[PDB]
From a paper:
Here we report the crystal structure of BbtPGRP3 at 2.7 Å resolution, showing an N-terminal hevein-like CBD followed by a classic PGRP domain at the C-terminus. Each asymmetric unit of the crystal contains one molecule of BbtPGRP3 (covering residues Gln19−Gly74 and Ser87−Gly254). It is composed of an N-terminal CBD (Gln19−Tyr71) and a C-terminal PGRP domain (Thr90−Val254) connected by a truncated linker (Ser72−Gly74, Ser87−Gly89). Notably, truncation of the linker from 18 to 6 residues did not lead to significant change of the amidase activity; thus only the wild-type BbtPGRP3 was applied to all following activity assays and comparisons. The CBD starts with a long N-terminal loop (Gln19−Glu40), followed by the core structure of a three-stranded antiparallel β-sheet (β1~3) and a helix α1. The CBD of BbtPGRP3 adopts an overall structure remarkably similar to the well-characterized U. dioica UDA. Besides, the four disulfide bridges (Cys27-Cys50, Cys41-Cys56, Cys49-Cys63, and Cys65-Cys68) that stabilize the BbtPGRP3 CBD also resemble the counterparts in UDA. All the four putative chitin-binding residues of the CBD of BbtPGRP3 could be superimposed to those in the structure of UDA complexed with a trisaccharide. At the center of the solvent-exposed valley, a zinc ion is tetrahedrally coordinated by the nitrogen atoms of residues His121, His230, the sulfur atom of Cys238, and a water molecule Wat1. Wat1 is further stabilized by the Oη atoms of the catalytic residue Tyr156, which have been proposed to facilitate a water-mediated nucleophilic attack on the lactyl-amide bond and stabilize the reaction intermediate, respectively.
PGNs are normally recognized, and/or hydrolyzed (amidases EC 3.5.1.28) in some cases, by a class of PRRs, termed peptidoglycan recognition proteins (PGRPs). The catalytic PGRPs possess the amidase activity that hydrolyzes the amide bond between the MurNAc and L-alanine moieties of PGN, via a coordinated Zn2+ ion. The full-length BbtPGRP3 consists of an N-terminal signal peptide (Met1−Ala18), followed by a CBD (Gln19−Tyr71) and a C-terminal PGRP domain (Thr90−Gly255), which are connected via an 18-residue linker from residues Ser72 to Gly89. All together, the modular evolution via gene horizontal transfer and domain shuffling results in a unique domain organization of BbtPGRP3, which has a higher amidase activity and a broader spectrum against invading bacteria.
Numbering used by the authors: 3 to 226
The structure:
Amino acid sequence: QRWRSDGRCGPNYPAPDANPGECNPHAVDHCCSEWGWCGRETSHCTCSSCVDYSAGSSGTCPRIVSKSEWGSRATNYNVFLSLPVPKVVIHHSAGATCSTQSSCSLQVRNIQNYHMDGRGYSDIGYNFLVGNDGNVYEGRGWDRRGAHALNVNTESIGICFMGDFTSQKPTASAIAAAKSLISCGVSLGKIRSGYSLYGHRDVGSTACPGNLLYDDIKSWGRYV
Ligand SMILES: [Zn+2]
């Protein structure tokens, strides 16, 4: 990857997939200092030759497409989650995949219409969605109680990958976007650092989030 395993970085310690060697954006030590160490302190982040990998397109926080950007309909749901959140539940759409911001935005619009008009929800059920386009889309957000898993709605953030992943896996960009979303939520204090990661099937009776995606999330950090 773009950072080393020994904790070094910079133009003197090249990474396997990166020269100069970089730092894990989602790690506590995400700044490459003068002395070629990945560190966390202000000195590591604010020197003239220092690089803070928390920031940028590859930072901890992924670009979240807001409700107004993906074309959400008017909602007025204000049932708030107790923050920070103990656990993260992973979902799959069990539906269409999407590869562009337009098609994924349309897909989110469809899912919202299904939840509100077909099932009678106050809004789209999930807190966030993720498309194969590598983007994150805003559902009920960080602060509002979701409707994605009955046993755990009040204690969790629901992230739903858009697609069916029983025999497929999402694009690497989708996975990266979800992980970065989680990391971001942790950095903000929306999600506890000692959070627990669940698949939907772990907390309910479904095949969600599909076999292969469920297999992949075991390798993610903090899976229960
Ligand atoms: Zn689910």
